[PDB]
Amino acid sequence: NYDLVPAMIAEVNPRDMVVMALVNTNVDPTLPPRWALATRNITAIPGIEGDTRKVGTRIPAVAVTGQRSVGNQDSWDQISPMPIAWATPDSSVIARAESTIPSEQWTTLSKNLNKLDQVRETKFDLLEL
Amino acid sequence: DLVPAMIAEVNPRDMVVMALVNTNVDPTLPPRWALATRNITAIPGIEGDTRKVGTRIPAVAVTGQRSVGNQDSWDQISPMPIAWATPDSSVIARAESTIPSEQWTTLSKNLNKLDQVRETKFDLLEL
Amino acid sequence: DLVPAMIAEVNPRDMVVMALVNTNVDPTLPPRWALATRNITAIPGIEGDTRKVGTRIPAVAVTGQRSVGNQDSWDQISPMPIAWATPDSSVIARAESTIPSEQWTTLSKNLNKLDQVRETKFDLLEL
Amino acid sequence: NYDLVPAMIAEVNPRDMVVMALVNTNVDPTLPPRWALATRNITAIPGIEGDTRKVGTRIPAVAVTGQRSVGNQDSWDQISPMPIAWATPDSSVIARAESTIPSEQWTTLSKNLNKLDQVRETKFDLLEL
Known part of the structure; x- marks a missing residue:
């Protein structure tokens, strides 16, 4: 119902970061997935400061x-x-999440x-692969 | 009142959007469909390719x-354009999907029918 | 289904929100008011002062x-939190004003009543 | 119904600018105005490039x-x-607008x-004066 997707920091700026996620654009999740890249500008993620x-x-x-x-x-x-880190402070549940994602x-x-700039050229920050 | 609009013309320093609108004051009546146009310059999110x-x-x-x-x-x-208020992608995508x-x-x-609409008194042409 | 929520507790590395919710499955009935809580870490827009x-x-x-x-x-x-989907200020402000x-x-x-809610089986306490 | 407010570039960044406007927070516009500052992140305004x-x-x-x-x-x-420049290409109507604002x-x-940073510390980018 609210399943795990990988996301990754794609760009870092003084006031924020841009994360890219790999998402399935099919409304029916049982079908073979229709992969896409979705980006989002994010100001803060617990745990992600400085060296990370x-x-x-x-x-x-x-x-x-x-x-x-x-x-x-x-x-x-x-x-x-x-980011699941907005929902849980628990380092091991976040660590688990990461290993669970293929x-x-x-x-x-x-x-x-x-492909960040290609994704940001789309109208809703979503680019099908 | 949410309506679909669409870029109908693109020029060097301006563009024209056309909307499908209902001109009846009473929204409980079957719609009285019309086309409305507006010359504008820019919309947040509408850059180059789009x-x-x-x-x-x-x-x-x-x-x-x-x-x-x-x-x-x-x-x-x-x-x-809704994007004049906010270009938030969830907002604009939801609005597009909400329109039949x-x-x-x-x-x-x-x-x-752009040229016909622009020939009317108020850039509004009932279908 | 839009509901009001509110920060009920703030801790070094987490916080707790409480919402006022209707537990009836049939929304046409008079509401069956309840309080629901959720431990979360962060909400876009909720920084320091707020x-x-x-x-x-x-x-x-x-x-x-x-x-x-x-x-x-x-x-x-x-x-x-709606801000988990988007922290757009028009969205969050409109949602707040839409809730009675x-x-x-x-x-x-x-x-x-936070501690009482957290004593229930599903962090949900009918009023 | 859609009346003129002054706005001004408050900050300039590589990908965008921040504009601040002076707005009246009263729903009834006939009352003495209740002034506030409202900010908005904007990517493009026709006419505003380079030296401006x-x-x-x-x-x-x-x-x-x-x-x-x-x-x-x-x-x-x-x-x-x-910005009214999103609605009209006509330099003199924009120039007129500017002189019309007190x-x-x-x-x-x-x-x-x-006060940009104070305004951005508020929850909806609106700070009453």
Whole structure:
């Protein structure tokens, strides 16, 4: 219902950071997934300060909300990722979350961090792979 | 009142949006569909690639003059892009999905009526 | 389903929000008012000064387990801050104003029932 | 109905600018005004590039939307300013707008540009004077 997605710091600025998440745009989650990259500008994530406030830092997340596509039904045209660290202070539950997310989803996200500007060129900060 | 709008023309230093609006003052009646146009310069989020004829722009129908003859209807309605208030992607995406797909289709099919709309007194043409 | 929530406790590395929720499954009935709490760490926009007991946080009531005895009601309801989806100021301000002032007042008056709520099975206490 | 407010560039960054506007938080505009500062992060304003993309540049604006206060009625607790340059390409209508806004409102705004960080410390980017 609120399942885990990988997210990662894609850019770091003085006042905020940009996180990119790997999300499934299918409304029906049982189908083969339709992967996309979703970005979000974030000011603060507990635990992410200083030496971990770096491009490439892993952030376990969930897709908290989305909006349906007009032309399609069956697809989300917008998806908001949130770090699970906003919901729990517990380091081991966050650590668990990270290991639970498939390594291959982690690697897919890592390989696409460099597409940040392509993603930000879309109208809802969502770019289908 | 949420309405679909769409970029109908793009020029070097301005653009024109067209909206599909209901001119009846009584919203409980079957809609009295009309096309309304507005010359604008910029919309937050509408940059380069997405700045083209056909791009969807959710809007609100700002009503003006009303009069009563054979119908009680608005004589002027001006679309205001929602992104003028906030370009938040959840807001704009939700607004687009809240507008019935039939209205988006109707607007896109009438997009070529721009010159006819601009020939009316208030840039408003009942369909 | 939009509900008022409020910071009920602030700790070094976490905080607790309380929401005023309706536990009836049938929304056409007079509400069955309850208080629901959730331990969270952070909310976009809730930083330093505004991070204190009493701060208003508009939320949605995420429903869980339902069962039918003398009433058909939700056994679990968890508030989710709207700012988790987007901290856009128009969104958060509109959501706060959309929730009746009577509900905000009721929540603020019951804010001191935190320990009683946390003593229930699902952090949900019918009023 | 959509009346003119002064706005001014309060901060300039690589990807965007922050504009501050002087707004009236009274829902009833006939009353003596209840002045406040409202800020907004803006990516692009026609005409504002390069030498005019500077802290202190005047931007004629209107208060396009607002949200009511919960405890009060009679007050807006959030107000979105927009540059009139988003609505018209015509340099003289924008120039007119600027001269139409009272000089004293201009000066009040100029004198408070330095309160940017106070305004951004509020929950809806609105600080009553």
